Amino acid sequence: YFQGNAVLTWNNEILPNWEWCSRKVRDLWWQGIPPSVRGKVWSLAIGNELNITHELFDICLARAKERWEASLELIKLDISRTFPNLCIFQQGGPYHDMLHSILGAYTCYRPDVGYVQGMSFIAAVLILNLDTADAFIAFSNLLNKPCQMAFFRVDHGLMLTYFAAFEVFFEENLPKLFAHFKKNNLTPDIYLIDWIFTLYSKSLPLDLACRIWDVFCRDGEEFLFRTALGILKLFEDILTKMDFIHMAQFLTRLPEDLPAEELFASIATIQMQSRNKKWAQVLTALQK
């Protein structure tokens, strides 16, 4: 084990010993979790603080199916553009009905939230890796996390404190690009919101997003902001030659072939510590 056979190492060595933070395990986790293992790790990491049951899922789906105004219009449109190169989530594909089911069931569970654009991408990633009811558990609980909540709710107060913490680490790690952004009025709301809200599932190709989700499962919300800084560092040279408009355009539609190994190398060089304070203490200080 830990001799280059990841599936066996995860299944035979790691998961029996879930209760995670071994140094050897953490290096392997950085490389991405095998697809056959992801569902189990993600479900465990995301958890079920909402205490959602399969029976709740069944009922909510039943209500959605009964219900089938412009909400379903938004669901259907978003589904049409969800990882469309794969042709698996779109109508006639083998995950389409499952995708519809998660989203419809969710609008019946939280009818006050309803459908928010980008949600299809989050649900799609989960249904590829989890059975539908378990995917619904993960989806619902993921949307409940402090970070995702802040980045979806109409009141922007909590989101501002995330922006502020993000900027502490941005200036720390990338002082020159930070200044360049400041001079050009390139504020976090231009690009960061979709990145953080969908955990990059709307912003990056599927396989790379999944690897980001893996390490998010290891390190929590801080990894999402570390990733954001990794992307900026990866493109720092080209960004620095752009004005406001070109930066905004580049950042809101990232390269389709964004190379995973190069992004991860860049993310690795980002340190989420400033003045010997970590992400959680910087954020808590900004919230308190």
Calpha distance 200→69 (Å, rounded): 28
Resolution value in angstroms = 2.0
In terms of CATH, what superfamily is 145-288?
Ypt/Rab-GAP domain of gyp1p, domain 3 (1.10.472.80)
Domain range summary for the chain, segments of one domain joined by +: 1-19+21-48, 49-144, 145-288
Instruction: Kindly state the tokens that stand for 197.
Output: 């809200």
Calpha distance 159→164 (Å, rounded): 9
Calpha distance 164→148 (Å, rounded): 16
The CATH topology of domain 1-19+21-48 is Arc Repressor Mutant, subunit A (1.10.10)
Identify the experimental approach. X-ray
CATH 2.60.40.420 fits domain 49-144: no
> What residues are paired with 273 via a beta bridge?
278
Cα distances (Å, whole numbers) of residue 29 to 10, 20, 25, 68: 9, 9, 6, 41
> What residues are paired with 278 via a beta bridge?
273
Residue recorded with tokens 């199916």: 65
Classify residue 136 by burial, with Cβ atoms within 10 Å: 0-12, 13-18, 19+: buried
Q: Minimal CA–CA distance to 231: which of 263, 205, 193, 270?
A: 263
Residue recorded with tokens 């720390």: 172
